[PDB]
């Protein structure tokens, strides 16, 4: 398929949706492949925001994913490695599908010189950094 | 069942405020699958609320067994890897789950050059 | 037990106080499974309080338990990868139960370009951000 | 090949928007070689551009590789440790084809001593 | 021996300001034991701050012995491993001992977009 | 070669745009040794200025070599951690060369206490730290 | 040697600004214990300020000290990681021992949403933070 | 040698200036010892500016001297591992050579709550 067709970007959707990689989608019987659901994003508002949906949908569902991964690794040197390398990819992911939500956290208590006031001095500009 | 259903929703939260991953829950019979809770979440705001205070519930019992899977590694050098990745992954996961309570947490001492006044030229 | 039962709760404190953790405090005879644990704090604050006061407490047993951990590992590759593990949780778990006393602690000297001030130029709002 | 031409910039470029690396395009007979490609950039501004548009939607499709290269990697020592190294390659890269994109991301929660308002002193 | 003693208080002081751990001082005859200690210094003030000077001259020990169990490391696998742990986790401790003195250290440059002026728009 | 000799210098600039380190192009047939490049650069600006921007290029080469170092790396325990320490290596060169274009890149979402706005009080200086 | 001897502490300065560790410096014939030279330092502001100046001038010699260690290793996976920890320790140590010079060091570009300007709101307090 | 000297001082900075360590400067008959170059520098203000300088052309070799160390590594585990060590260790000292050319590098993009405005209040 190389022609817009909305049934199967809604398929593409719903299957992002469930967690399951674009790349894995693309094999399935009678999909397009990946570079044509690229242009199909760049050319169809109506897909991108769709896929856009289906993106935040897709972070929760290997959210879940990620867990399962690292319980049910097989306890030999390279699956366990290789659990670790998905498990990393999808973290890094996650964060970048939905940064608001799986973004890292960090708690910044500022304090200034010896843990008194933050000391902040002003002057006048002392070059041209306009 | 995929028509949102309150109640089954309420124990849906019940049943991760007790510890009990989304994944088990949604392997009960009845239970709706794991599209279906999300798809509901997305269009009912009632729910996301219940739900996210029955996550960071859950986070708390997470929390606890990372000491667990630690402490109880086979001393056998995949299966401490794989436990390493278990706690690994927990300690990630509940960063997101309760942001407040489980994100990094540092004290940043602010000074300026040679540990003066923080020096700032304005325009 | 079910029933919140107060004298059971303030063994749980003592416990945890001296650095057990709540998995293995629920293994002793006679105690609350964890989720009744749970389920008592959401309940009470009266626990709730005492709770709090007994993570505190809890940390600092933690922290000099680290060093013992480290310094007894069997000089075996597991079993130092194990103690490793056990460390580096203990870590992560003392910076969450305290933060002010074990989170990071960094000192950061703020300077401006070239090692001068540091430059700002301050401009009236150029779109709708308010 | 080492004169400027448009035309054949606009093929490179499409041929960056659909997943190819340049070094394969360049690789194709008839294409500059890598060193032109860049010079044309450099003393080319309309070029530099319709290319950094290309090189983000190149990046899309390289962040679906990684779960690919990822979970179809070859159990063994090795192979797995070259699959890690290709994804790391590959998700630092990301940052730099689209940092709006792919940047790392934190959401800092800025507090003062013990949980308070945060105190300056100013002069 | 449960009730708070001075003297007592300023024996354990005088013992870890001179590089004993704790854990060794309470396992002294006539000691009170760790969970003792601390409810102590929950309950008085006094004590909280001589015992903080101590932690402080405790770390001065710990950063020089840091040095000894990396250089006197047995050059085998798994001794190197718990050499390095046993290093890692004083290198921690420490800056929690002492925050002003041994925690991290960083000279943060700031700049504007482009190396120019930071550039802020206020409402 | 001792002598600055413009011809070299281009020639220089020439085969570092195109990727190549300077020690692996002061091997090359008849060209000068490391000491004498950075010599001849300290003692004249026309070459520290090609030599810039020779630098930046280098950089963009370097950008698409690392996907290649990675990619062809031979299966083996030892030479994929070559290929991971000759990638480490350029990716860290990589940032200095060209710090904007190859520098980290983070998006900070700064918030305040309980996600509210950033509460901050201004207060006299209390010392003298003018 | 228990009560402070001037001559002896100004031996410990020369040697510990060569490099020397204090323990392995307390291990020569003659010398102190470190908790010796701890309580001196305690109680004499003579040595304390000498001791500062030696402090520095021992950072600079591993400064030195580091890729020497690197350089030497011998080539056995133990030794190897050996002169790692030895190497990631005085790291670690120089930092600590003079942060103005051996602190980490980064440079910041700092820009707003999009790339354009930083944008600020202020509001009034909505809450009593004073 | 012990009493200070310009031009031995002039000789030791172009030594370094040309890609030396001051260990090997050091080796070197006639040459100061370490020890002596430092003292030198605390007392001598002029000398700590050249010497300075120095350094900044030193890591200016040293800069290219890692790529080196990374692509000739031998191919066996310990060799790698030395050689990666030996580029790790040079990587941190060059930022301490010259910051502003060898420091991290990064861009920062600043944003207030869901990616709106930045939101202070102030007393």
Known sequence: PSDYMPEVADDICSL???????????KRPGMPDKSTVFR???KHEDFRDKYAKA????????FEE???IADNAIPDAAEVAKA?????????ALA??????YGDKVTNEL??????????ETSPMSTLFG
Chains 1, 3, 6, 7 share one sequence.
Request: aromatic share 6%.
């Open 96 to 101: 970048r599908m939905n940064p608001r939500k």
């Open 66 to 68: 990620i867990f399962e």
């Open 40 to 42: 199909w994003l760049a």
């Open 16 to 26: 992002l949706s469930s967690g399951e990689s674009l790349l894995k989608v693309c």
């Open 84 to 92: 670790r390398l998905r498990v990393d990819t999808r973290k890094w």
């Open 111 to 120: 304090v200034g010189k010896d843990g008194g006031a933050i000391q902040i």
């Open 55 to 62: 993106t935040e949908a897709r972070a929760d569902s290997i």
